[PDB]
Amino acid sequence: DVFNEDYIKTSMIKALEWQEAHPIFAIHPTDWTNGAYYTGVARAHHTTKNMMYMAALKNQAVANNWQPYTRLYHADDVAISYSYLYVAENEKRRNFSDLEPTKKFLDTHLYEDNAWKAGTNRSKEDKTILWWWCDALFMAPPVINLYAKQSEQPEYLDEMHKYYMETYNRLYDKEEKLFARDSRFVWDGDDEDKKEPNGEKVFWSRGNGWVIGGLALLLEDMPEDYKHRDFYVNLYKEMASRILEIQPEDGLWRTSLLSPESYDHGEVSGSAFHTFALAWGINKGLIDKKYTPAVKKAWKAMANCQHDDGRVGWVQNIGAFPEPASKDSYQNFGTGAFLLAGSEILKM
Amino acid sequence: DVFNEDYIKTSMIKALEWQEAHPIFAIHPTDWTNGAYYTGVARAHHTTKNMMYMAALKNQAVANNWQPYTRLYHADDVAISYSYLYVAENEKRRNFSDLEPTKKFLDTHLYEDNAWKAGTNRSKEDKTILWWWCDALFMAPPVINLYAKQSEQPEYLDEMHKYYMETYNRLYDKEEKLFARDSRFVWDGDDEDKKEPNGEKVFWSRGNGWVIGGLALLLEDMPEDYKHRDFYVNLYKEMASRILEIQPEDGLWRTSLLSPESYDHGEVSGSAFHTFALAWGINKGLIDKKYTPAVKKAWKAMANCQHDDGRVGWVQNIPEPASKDSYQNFGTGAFLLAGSEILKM
Amino acid sequence: DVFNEDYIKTSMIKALEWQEAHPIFAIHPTDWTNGAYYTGVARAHHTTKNMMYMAALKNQAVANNWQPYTRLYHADDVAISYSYLYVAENEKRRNFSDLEPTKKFLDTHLYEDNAWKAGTNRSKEDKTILWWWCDALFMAPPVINLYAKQSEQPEYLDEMHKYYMETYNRLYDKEEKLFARDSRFVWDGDDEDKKEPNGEKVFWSRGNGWVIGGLALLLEDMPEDYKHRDFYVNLYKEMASRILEIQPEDGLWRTSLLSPESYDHGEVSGSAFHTFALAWGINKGLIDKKYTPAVKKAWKAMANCQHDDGRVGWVQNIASKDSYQNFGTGAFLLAGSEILKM
Q1: Beta-carbon pairs below 8 A across chains A and B
Q2: Shortest distance, CA B59 to any CA of chain C (angstroms)
Q3: Is residue C248 a contact partner of residue C266, using CB atoms and an 8 Å limit?
Q4: What Å distances lie between residue B218 and B30, B40, C23, CA to CA?
Q5: 3 state DSSP class of C239
């Protein structure tokens, strides 16, 4: 019974236990894959207050010495600080959490020059603004926002806004209400554009999941009266509206948003970010309650991809565009997304 | 059959496995929560000799670089050295274990001045002697005894005894035969005496379980001829009689010793310390064998609170109400201590 | 149903998950027990390509900061570098893998003097050549061989061969086609001779498992035209023919190879090394096809010693249905990794 509150809490614990027994990273335990994963752990804790989530969060923060990863120009490398900030706020204990290494990262990232800001890169991926790919909008903005809030330094939000607007102005497709992953996927309108197998624009489900899930985390903690809030609220509603509209019949979004018929089964990690962001918006009254059944159908479909031992399956491995997954494929960020969806499904 | 030797062994291993897969700490892997946990893992090893226990003990000792935690005035931060001392004795490898950080801790703890010894603290907790709260008598005394034993330096015991007597003189209720947690729970006869709803003095089950289970560990290894040994033996027998006398009908002590009716279910960690200390005393001949069925009733109750995947449940946190899913690493340690003695009965 | 491809892949994943949940070492996570274990994990990845094996390999290499253990004269302390070289080759990723600590170890191990090379030791074990005990032939040669291959430095193979020949000249019993563990077990025809309860020479199953397993790994990656290759092929063929010949009825080698009657039950870790090496050679064409049933029978007997939760049991410590070791799980994964390919 996938909608039963104890079912959902037990499924969430089992997903945590499975992933804790299978640690994984792309390049380091402090990298974006674990940052996204522990961000989901953090929200699962926020909803259930179960000590086991907080144990895992504290475990990893201590093991990593409260360090972000080390490419200071690189948004991916600060995603882990969300978990650090969350524990610092929610574990009231002196001589324990340390936010200095996060502060140091953010100061360099935001205020120091680097090759990406300088716009001197000449590659296909076009690495000529700080956040030149859409996934960055999950990795850095929610951390800068929670940092600004906890430290009472609103100026970080201004710097966040400047870079978020650059990404938005480059990659947000105003006609389709979805983000291209990077400049390669923006159309010039001719026979050399990158297209899906059915000829449509490429909009990657997890790619857009990062953005919309980043919006839900952002709006969760951004001040009510922040001077640019309306910009974020409206982007969130526009993207939510499209994602709802293109949700496949069986409830799971495919890895390709506009060419879902290219895949035989839906993909869990992008679907989990959408279900998180959607359930969040319904719970906050930003999205009409009549959308509850669509958000529940996704939840049901993802719940049925979870193995008896807790593994969250049907997750596409690391990438930058639509690719297949299978029933045993997993990743820590995919467990993280499932934990995010569950943490909001529980509040409906 | 919860009394079958093979049932108990497989239960204890599952409790270890489940806790190893769910590591936890209050402030650090070397903190008292882990020191109590791995002291239960040490005693499980000592009874069963299963290589799985010793693997887990060596893994954390090496991962922690043999260090206790860092507040050298604080008995909680040396609890972890019990496991280190146990590995140094029982893992037969020269040049593997390092007891120097434990020695550095004990020398500063016992011989150098600090603000708790100075007596100037003005808090409600009254942190005006080294071991100003009763739980400290599980954390430091058993480690100082093992250290004194392996170093053959009995002066460490004399120093242990001095501080142990301060805690006993402040907190042991000679009429009730149980310990108050700290000065706040000691009655002065005035307006803010702390009472249970039934009017009785407040004695915490796990608080007393730290003390009596610490007494069993101490007497396990203290020399038969130590000058002060009788004092610990009679303390142990007095607390044991009272703890037996107040045991609830279903086997499990509640979090409150003199007001069990304030809780709707028994609590596992305190009960496990009592069960360990009581079983140990029966096996050593300090407690009369007629008390076996009661010790056994407690083991059965706790064995039924273990989940199928090994989780030891009904453990009150360091607080949310204790529930069937609630666990702690020191609760799994206490369950392993109990099992380690039930096995030898 | 132990021969089905699926049963085999899921058994190996269970063995991995059980071992990963039960970390163990003799003295350090980078010691030989773990080197053996991760070497099985790397071969399981090589056959299956399952991302789970690679996550475990990457995890331990970063946790250990790519360091072998610390006695540079000692072959045991470099066994963990096989997994590091494996990751470096197979995880295509910049500024991630580090082979400098392995290179430093091998340069000192192979090219600098030490007390064992100097020949001054005067004990029963006779620690007077670099690799004075046969297990060292699993620990160091495969790592040297893989380092030589990835660095394009065949001079490392030449130095490997010098030390391998020493251990061969001392410890390989040419009439029995098996290795003695060290000089204590070699006969000189006096009362000091060590014998089994039945009068036979002592040949240890795991001891020999290390050698023949080492030889499969070595032959897997040594260039085909390497000038010393025939020595290694011939040795591998001789050992494999004998180990086939002495394999007990129920499929499992006992701890003692010439006195299996001194034990009630076979032992898994040694068996799993034999099974890996024998299955490897059948697959490579070095061993006759007709020996498939004998290797299949080993795999089945081993498969039946795995608990439901993945534990590989009946492994003698450094033996009972419960007894396990990390290098026993490693040997099980090695065997599986070749059985899959038959």
Answers
A1: 25
A2: 7
A3: yes
A4: 21, 14, 31
A5: helix
Q: Answer yes or no: C1 catalytic.
A: no
A20 touches chain B (CB under 8 A): yes
Instruction: Look up residue C80 and give its DSSP letter.
Output: T
CA C5 vs CA A109, C278, C331, C333, C340: distances in Å: 50, 19, 18, 14, 6
Which helix (H) or strand (E) segment holds residue C260: the answer is none
Tokens 């049991």 identify what position? C313
DSSP state of B178: E
Query: Which candidate from A22, A27, A28 shows the least CB-CB separation from C55?
Result: A22
The reply to whether C23 touches chain B by the CB within 8 Å rule is yes
Cα dist from C163 to C82, C105, C106, whole Å: 18, 16, 13
Cβ neighbours of residue C80 closer than 8 Å, sequence gap 6 or more: C30, C31, C32, C34, C35, C38, C64, C68, C69
**The pair of three-digit structure tokens given for residue B25, joined into one six-digit string:** 């700490």
Question: Looking at domain B1-345, which CATH architecture does it have?
Answer: Alpha/alpha barrel (1.50)
Task: Report the Cα–Cα distance between both ends of chain C, in Å, rounded.
Answer: 16
CATH code of C1-342, in short, is: 1.50.10.10
* Closest-approach residue (CA) in chain A for C51: A329
Q: Would you list the domain boundaries of chain A? A: 1-348
Residue A249 burial (CB count, 10 A): 8
8 A C-beta contact, residue B269 and residue B336: no
Beta-sheet pairing, C172-173 with B178-179: unpaired
Fill in the amino acid letter for B227.
K
**Cβ neighbours for C101, distance < 8 A, ≥ 6 positions apart:** C65, C66, C67, C68
d(CA C13, CA B92): 33
- Distance in Å, alpha carbon of A346 to nearest chain B alpha carbon: 19
8 Å CB contact of C96 and A27:
yes
For residue C36, give every residue at least 6 positions away whose Cβ sits within 8 Å of its Cβ, in sequence order, or none: C79, C138, C326, C327, C330, C331
Query: Cβ distance B314 to B267 under 8 Å?
Result: yes
Nearest 5 degrees, angle CA B199-CA B203-CA B209? 160
Class of CATH domain A1-348:
mainly alpha
Widest Cα–Cα separation across chain A: 61
Resolution in units of Å: 1.9
Helix C326-339 vs helix C32-48: angle between axes, to the nearest 10 degrees? 20
Task: List the 36-95 stretch of C: residues with Cβ below 8 A of A.
Answer: 51-52, 55, 58-59, 62, 93, 95
